[PDB]
Write a protein that binds this ligand. Sequence first.
Ligand SMILES: Nc1nc2c(ncn2[C@@H]2O[C@H](COP(=O)(O)OP(=O)(O)OP(=O)(O)O)[C@@H](O)[C@H]2O)c(=O)[nH]1
Ligand SMILES: Nc1ncnc2c1ncn2[C@@H]1O[C@H](COP(=O)(O)OP(=O)(O)CP(=O)(O)O)[C@@H](O)[C@H]1O
Ligand SMILES: Nc1nc2c(ncn2[C@@H]2O[C@H](COP(=O)(O)OP(=O)(O)O)[C@@H](O)[C@H]2O)c(=O)[nH]1
Ligand SMILES: CC(C)(C)c1nc[nH]c1/C=c1\[nH]c(=O)/c(=C/c2cc(F)ccc2F)[nH]c1=O
Ligand SMILES: [Ca+2]
Ligand SMILES: [Ca+2]
Ligand SMILES: [Mg+2]
Ligand SMILES: [Mg+2]
Lengths: 424, 309, 63, 437
Amino acid sequence: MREIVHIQAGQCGNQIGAKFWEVISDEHGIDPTGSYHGDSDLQLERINVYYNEATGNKYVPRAILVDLEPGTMDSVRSGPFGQIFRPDNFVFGQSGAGNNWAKGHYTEGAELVDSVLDVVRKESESCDCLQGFQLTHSLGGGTGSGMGTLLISKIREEYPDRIMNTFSVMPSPKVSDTVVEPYNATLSVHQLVENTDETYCIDNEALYDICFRTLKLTTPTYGDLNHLVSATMSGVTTCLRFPGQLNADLRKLAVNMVPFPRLHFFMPGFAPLTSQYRALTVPELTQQMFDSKNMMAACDPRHGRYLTVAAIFRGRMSMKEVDEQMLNVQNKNSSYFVEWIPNNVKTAVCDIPPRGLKMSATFIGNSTAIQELFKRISEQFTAMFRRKAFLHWYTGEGMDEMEFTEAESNMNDLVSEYQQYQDA
Amino acid sequence: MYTFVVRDENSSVYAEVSRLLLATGQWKRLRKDNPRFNLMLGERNRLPFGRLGHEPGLVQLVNYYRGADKLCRKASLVKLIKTSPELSESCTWFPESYVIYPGNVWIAKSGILISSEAHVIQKYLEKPLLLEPGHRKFDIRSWVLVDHLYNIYLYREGVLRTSSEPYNSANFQDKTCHLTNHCIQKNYGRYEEGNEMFFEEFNQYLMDALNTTLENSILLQIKHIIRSCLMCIEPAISTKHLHYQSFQLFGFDFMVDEELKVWLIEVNGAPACAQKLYAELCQGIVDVAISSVFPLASIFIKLHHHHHH
Amino acid sequence: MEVIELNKCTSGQSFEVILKPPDPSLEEIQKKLEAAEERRKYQEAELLKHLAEKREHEREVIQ
Amino acid sequence: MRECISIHVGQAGVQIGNACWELYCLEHGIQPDGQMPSDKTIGGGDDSFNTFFSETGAGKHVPRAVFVDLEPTVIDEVRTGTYRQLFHPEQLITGKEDAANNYARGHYTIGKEIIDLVLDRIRKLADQCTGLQGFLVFHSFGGGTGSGFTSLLMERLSVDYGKKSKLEFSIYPAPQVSTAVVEPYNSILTTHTTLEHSDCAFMVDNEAIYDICRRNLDIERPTYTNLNRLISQIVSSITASLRFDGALNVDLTEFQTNLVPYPRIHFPLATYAPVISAEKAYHEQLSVAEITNACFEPANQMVKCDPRHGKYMACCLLYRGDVVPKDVNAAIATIKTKRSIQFVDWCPTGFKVGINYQPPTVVPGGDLAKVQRAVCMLSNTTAIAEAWARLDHKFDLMYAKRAFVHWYVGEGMEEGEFSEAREDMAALEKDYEEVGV
Ligand SMILES: Nc1nc2c(ncn2[C@@H]2O[C@H](COP(=O)(O)OP(=O)(O)OP(=O)(O)O)[C@@H](O)[C@H]2O)c(=O)[nH]1
Ligand SMILES: Nc1ncnc2c1ncn2[C@@H]1O[C@H](COP(=O)(O)OP(=O)(O)CP(=O)(O)O)[C@@H](O)[C@H]1O
Ligand SMILES: Nc1nc2c(ncn2[C@@H]2O[C@H](COP(=O)(O)OP(=O)(O)O)[C@@H](O)[C@H]2O)c(=O)[nH]1
Ligand SMILES: CC(C)(C)c1nc[nH]c1/C=c1\[nH]c(=O)/c(=C/c2cc(F)ccc2F)[nH]c1=O
Ligand SMILES: [Ca+2]
Ligand SMILES: [Ca+2]
Ligand SMILES: [Mg+2]
Ligand SMILES: [Mg+2]
């Protein structure tokens, strides 16, 4: 188990997705044309995880680019690292999805889905040992939400034993394109509860607040939000992209993070938050990465309890000082970690730091506090749905109200289930 | 900021130790089944000593010495004394006691039978020391705190648990003159409050009636018995070099006979303090047993004696 | 304290000192390995039965 | 002589195998290429070391070893390492996809497709044996391969080799060097299914080895390499009686006779002294008394527990170096009067001493200093049940909530096998107390 297949769907998916390949290609010493110009062998030791080797010793990302319109996929190809992707993996429709989940999942995206799966099958075929799939998408729009969740369902049929993880940007009125995002998200969450092993809940509320409050940017663009996402995405992918004596694959990681199958929605985080000169000490990284202010999902971990935590530190530091500092927050805040999973916080340290920083830390938390996220979208949903508002856009694409009632009920079930373990 | 747990609800002593710790701002109480503690205030029976000292990054302390039940059960206390050389079968400060499983007056106990006809059968002290005016029996209770380093700390305030009835040689069935326990009495409070005389008054009575002191006539013998008993079992229970550390509070029950000889009756593993003295002892347990191990931002007399031979 | 059964050789020696005196078959394994595979393939069937129903709902909506 | 086959299942098994076979080679003067200059019968022999090594006509000495792992990366470092020439490729077996710290995946799912291959490669070694004794099985309690595939192997070995003994070298899980959260489940599951099939099992709590490396070797944050080189010294201590001339513990059956009177209670506590750092400039060399006395300090035990609150069924002192019978008996006398060493009523209060005059061999550039004399006590004490209670409690906490269970069930396994395996452990803990109180 080494090869991962990456898929990026919709505007958001392709944006944060393009930044992911920008960041990690720099870390693995791969230039914009696909040629290696590094210095450490550690940059090529597990390069097969995210790159196919091509003729002339070129490295081509195992990446499939999906959208129901050409706009954003033409920007990606024009953008800084757009030349590195295999041209065959650019799979696109024409008429878009109008921020409509129905169009993505049932009508427009249906027409395109089988051609995307052929590229997946192409990449999956020439893979020595495929360990799983990752998807980048928003749950607020049409393509990434509707077609992304359709693709996840189709991949699970064809590859029922491979791991399916997502990087799922949640909508927020603070950073809002259309009033129907809560509808689109609620329909998607129901899909992810069934068909993904892990889902990284990137909340745009949380990224905005981080850009506004704790980075002093008055007018945050999507690029500013996407900077935080790519830093986190580099973070969660480090332990597979490098050593150091960690004998783990996606399944092994998923086994140790997901105690209950439906409850696999993680609270990502990053220290230090950037947009420096003084490098952070190990106590600062630890206090920051556990800090609510550095959480990429807008939930207060004090309002829930941790089922599992995974922290991975980057850079040259004392593993003794890490062990000490990680044990200090558990033993001084033990009420917020469930007692009934002994030793639920686990840690790794990678020698190679990311670009810019001398030492960082990436936080992955399966806290029950994530219910707050699903409650917030469930409230926004009901406000509209109790008056059947904006439903004509979905019923005109052949959906029934019954499906909304179902999806509402399934997410309120998920919230009830998180509540169960918070009180036990 | 340290952490503790409470797994004994009856414990009147460690109820106060729990309260004193909380009212500092540097100790947080956790739930009964939380593993991530510094201090365990544990149950009487089946205290899980195997689970202590296995949590990474936490120095763990517990308020019981494992294997100290060999001193606190009556059956084992007799067997300990007859089998140990350090306190032999020819031991002068312990009454002649035997073991048969379920002046020739004896006493049986573990319902208390005092006769010559008739668990452990023990030589009953027919001629005990009798307080006047009253002509009445008593027993002395001394509170000993053994810390993690096995420093034996004798608390300076003890108490006489007195009978209020005249002692009768011929009349054995009447229990209120022979047995001097606090529960059995409640003449309950005729001479002293709640059948409790303290070390100041008892020193004064001795000076007046017997021309001697408590420190000389009785307390030297007490200190020899406490030290002898605890040093005997030190190798079996000591937590030096161990992955968790222990302390414990003990209660030593004594009897003084007519010729001023002190006799050991029972050692008490989970002892209750006298009403007045709770405040001071429970602060002492914190100062010496807890705060030594976990430092924050004497009422005891230390027992040590290296005579060379 | 008696030192009994002392045996010596050029590379070592050994002795005892006494201080005081006083399965299922190949059938059943290959059976229950396969019984778990039956439950594994029943669970994977239930998945592809459930997903088959999602596929006919997808056709029903577009129709 | 009678031959012994060593089996190394899973990462922990494999890398501990590495350490042991490196050490065995130094002890018998065998080199990385496999030549042994001191051996004069080329092409064969029935010497003591031949119990662990076979021989070829070219002069190579070949470990009677089988390394199994459900993924390649760990055994690939044997294939490319310092002792690559030592092994035949058929001895090194690897799958593609591991057990993901999942007992059920290792036992049932991925076990089933490799069990027959592994038995076949073991039979290839058993057919080179003029009189096979049995097996030394090395594995982790916490890993999926270590827990799951080991237990399946042990079941099949009892069928295919009913007359032969089976010894376990087991690595009991420690949170401070495991990233696996589901180890309590894996440890209990394998211990249930392996219990009737294992004749004697030597447990090594990673927690204990880790602190011995901190406290005594001054190693700030011990690696697996630090832990494994220390474990192999202990393992060698235990297996030296099989590999050298001697009269104590000469076959695998004598381990069971000497150490295990009650067959279910087959977990002897190892204690080992002295552990001294090579970076230590000035070291005063410890006497027979001091190192024997060190065997009754819990800080040196392979599992942390308190032998004072328990009872012994058997004890074995295995000395390496300058040691004579009378210095040992004098130490035993001194120690008996000072410490709490209570035996069970039906067993004699005594000690089976074994001495080898060759001092402990140390890996060049390693952490351990050369010593004049060392000892490994092997004692079947009821105090080691402390380890079970701890593990069982953790199991109970998780399993009350059915935490992580779906992963096991999802690989075909039944929920009933959790409580079934826990009741066997509940029985085992109760056997220990009956014997020990
Ligand atoms: N002493 C020691 N312990 C180890 C070593 N490798 C792993 N462990 C321990 O073994 C447990 C994890 O089991 P592993 O052996 O890595 O797992 P595995 O048998 O490879 O099984 P899968 O990974 O599930 O295929 C943890 O408690 C680790 O600390 C080692 O080299 N030495
Ligand atoms: N050999 C003896 N001679 C005289 N009196 C004796 C005696 N043995 C016991 N007693 C008396 O019996 C009373 C109670 O007996 P004992 O002290 O053995 O048990 P106990 O459990 O009531 C003490 P505690 O509950 O405080 O630990 C004591 O107050 C003591 O005066
Ligand atoms: N963080 C982030 N969110 C985005 C970005 N682009 C769009 N979004 C969010 O995604 C939702 C709209 O989905 P979008 O991806 O544009 O629709 P699609 O192209 O049909 O998938 C809204 O909630 C937006 O807030 C981006 O670059 N970064
Ligand atoms: C700290 C460590 C021992 C590596 C650990 N233990 C449990 N979880 C983890 C850490 C991760 N756990 C994960 O599930 C995880 C997800 C992930 C990893 C990838 F490499 C790619 C895609 C992913 F979704 N990334 C992690 O870094
Ligand atoms: Ca069309
Ligand atoms: Ca030969
Ligand atoms: Mg858009
Ligand atoms: Mg493995």
